[PDB]
From a paper:
The MlaFEDB-mediated glycerophospholipid (PL) transport was reported to play an important role in maintaining the integrity of the lipid membrane.
To understand the mechanism of glycerophospholipid translocation coupled with the conformational change, distinct conformations of MlaFEDB were trapped using sodium ortho-vanadate. The structure of Vclose shows the tight dimerization and close proximity of the NBD of MlaF subunits, caused by the trapping of ADP–vanadate or ATP at the ATP-binding sites comprising the Walker A, Walker B motifs, and the signature motif. The dimerization of the NBDs engages the coupled structural rearrangements of MlaE and MlaD, respectively. The MlaD ring rotates clockwise and the two subunits of MlaE squeeze towards each other to collapse the central phospholipid-binding cavity to extrude lipids. No bound glycerophospholipid densities were observed in the central cavity in Vclose. The three vanadate-trapped structures of MlaFEDB reveal different levels of conformational rearrangement of MlaD and MlaE coupled with nucleotide binding and glycerophospholipid translocation.
Residue numbers in the entry:
A (entry chain L), E (entry chain J): 171 to 193
B (entry chain L): 3 to 57
C (entry chain K): 3 to 193
D (entry chain J): 3 to 113
F (entry chain D): 1 to 256
G (entry chain A): 53 to 207
Write the structure that this text describes.
Amino acid sequence: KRGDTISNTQGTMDLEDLISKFI
Amino acid sequence: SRTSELAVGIFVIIFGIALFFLAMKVSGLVGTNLSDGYTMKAQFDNVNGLKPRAK
Amino acid sequence: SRTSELAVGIFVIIFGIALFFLAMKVSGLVGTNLSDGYTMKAQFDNVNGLKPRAKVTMSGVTIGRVDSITLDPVTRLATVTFDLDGKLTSFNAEQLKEVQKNALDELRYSSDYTQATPAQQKTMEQQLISNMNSITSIDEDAYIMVATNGLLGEKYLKIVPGGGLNYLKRGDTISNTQGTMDLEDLISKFI
Amino acid sequence: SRTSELAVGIFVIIFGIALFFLAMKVSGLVGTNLSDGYTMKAQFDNVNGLKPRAKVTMSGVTIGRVDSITLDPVTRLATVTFDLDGKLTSFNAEQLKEVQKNALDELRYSS
Amino acid sequence: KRGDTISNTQGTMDLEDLISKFI
Amino acid sequence: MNTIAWLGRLVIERIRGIGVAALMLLQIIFSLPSAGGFGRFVYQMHRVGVMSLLIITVSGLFIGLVLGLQGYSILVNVGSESMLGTMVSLTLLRELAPVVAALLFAGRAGSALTAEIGSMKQSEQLASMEMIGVDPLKQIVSPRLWAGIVSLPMLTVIFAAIGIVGGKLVGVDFLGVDEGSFWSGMQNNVQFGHDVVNGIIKSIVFALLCTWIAVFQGYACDPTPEGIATAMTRTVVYSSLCVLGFDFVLTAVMFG
Amino acid sequence: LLIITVSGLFIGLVLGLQGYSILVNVGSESMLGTMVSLTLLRELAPVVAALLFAGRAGSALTAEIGSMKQSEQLASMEMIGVDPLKQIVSPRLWAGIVSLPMLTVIFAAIGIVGGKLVGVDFLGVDEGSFWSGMQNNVQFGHDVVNGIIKSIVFA
């Protein structure tokens, strides 16, 4: 509805977690 | 030359106004207005460098 | 003769704007530099970063523009409106004679010509008269996709032929599309 | 009079130098041209982002350019027209006979 | 010879193709 | 209504004149000049060009020192200090050396063609010339106009040559940039027949509209030494409106 | 006033037109708003504003006083008794000081708003990344204020 809060989301990954996942 | 003068004014004035209008419009307010703009929400954990008035 | 200077003073100042709009042809903002262009459309699912006045290529030859990008929320797909320059994506007297004899021999071969109506004299002219009315170049399973222009370029529609057997007129819709590629899901699905 | 014959003659001195600067130290047409250069052609699939007057190389040496990039709707391809060099691509007569009987060594190659 | 056509050609490869290079 | 009709009449009269200046312009060039014309023609080069030379070197030296100073410091952060030589060349050559060369030329010699002819109007040194009998359209106009056409492409090349050589002085002598990547950055991207030649064809029609206005607006002006300055701006105003108004058609016909 | 708007509209239309097309190839169309602002504000709006002002009014202060020298307009004024250094110089000089920083701001305002017109209306650039490119990189007290202190001694 025009006014809701979309519940299911996901945040963004920064490049720093990309570094740690890389190794 | 009533005719002459009047005619001259006409064109001149029209142009000027129109121009200024469009110009002031292409900046800041003036025109900038959506249609049927409602509002939703969401809640994240890490926005990370998101800005106001993004896309 | 006081009005003569006045008359030339009009004759120059209306001529100067006329050449000023003559430069507005080839500049490319207003107007199109397209000799008998024709519109076609396609439907995507991801048109990320695809501006109007984009590029449309065949293998590297720019043969079109992009005019408008529209949505329709009842099906949540994108719909692209574009025109192609055709005197070089459209055939002529040599190729129209070439393609008409091509598909009637290849597609309408003994698998297709000897499985048909009783009189094989009217339908043989039907395959050729269905092709003269503004056929373009693009086969039945040619696909259109969105490239990325090198490594850090800007997005543009790439038309790739699939060889195929039947072509499509000026007004159709390409039925094999795919959206852009994105580094968001790919690094997640690689790591 | 006498100063005027000097002070505009010295002006055409400087303008000639500053044209020589642009021609022979900046732009490409500073002599870029090989001897008897012949042309060939080839066909491609992706000529994406390739301007005319590009470079052509064999081992990283600038042996020629690309002249014209046309499409052909007869077969849905792109056919590149380009001119190579004639000296760096053709063998000299000494290099010709060096490989000609070596091609006869290749021809009479045992079997 | 001069004026011939070189065979065995392959065109350029870009970001929209390097995905097809790996997977 | 009143002021409006007034302005209307104004515009009409102005347009009428303009046209005139066209009728003057054919009458100068469509006649063969006599002996003694080349001698004043050299002195006009002595007057217009050679005197204008000392200015455009300094403003030529300046703009290259600035344009290669600031874009690089943002450009160095990714991978590119070798494209420094391209961006300095291709914006001076196809964009600024037509435009900014004239606005310094309309400044100096775009005035001194008017006030030298606003000279001969106030003390009737125009009218005495006709009365003795010459025609100043042959005498004091045509050697002035023919120097104005010639001397501007003779300067705007001179301008951009020090314009590029200026930016070399900040790069290799202070920013430590590689010399080979500097020049061969230009050599690959700056063709001759499409940039430097078409930087001249911009500078000719930037020279004609700048110098023909500055001759006419000093000739047909009333000798009042107040309005000799209002006539002075209409040189500069109508030059700068048209030297900028005809870049945008000339950029579009060359490329785009 | 009527001059510097047109040359103000021009230079922004050019500077955001050509650098981007080389800059778009790596990753940056969002730094378009920074490079237009920081070269107009700290570099050109001091310099190119004066060379149009020295053109128009840098002449009409001389020839209006080269007026009163040829017909002894000047000399009659002293002879009747005023002093033109108080009369015809000081109201001329005090307008010349004031009116140039009153223009070079006006110049660069249309200078930036000009480059917006090529970007969002023809190149399709994002509006939010355009302005917030500027707001992070262009401080007020170090650029726009120090673009004025250049324009006073240039006036």
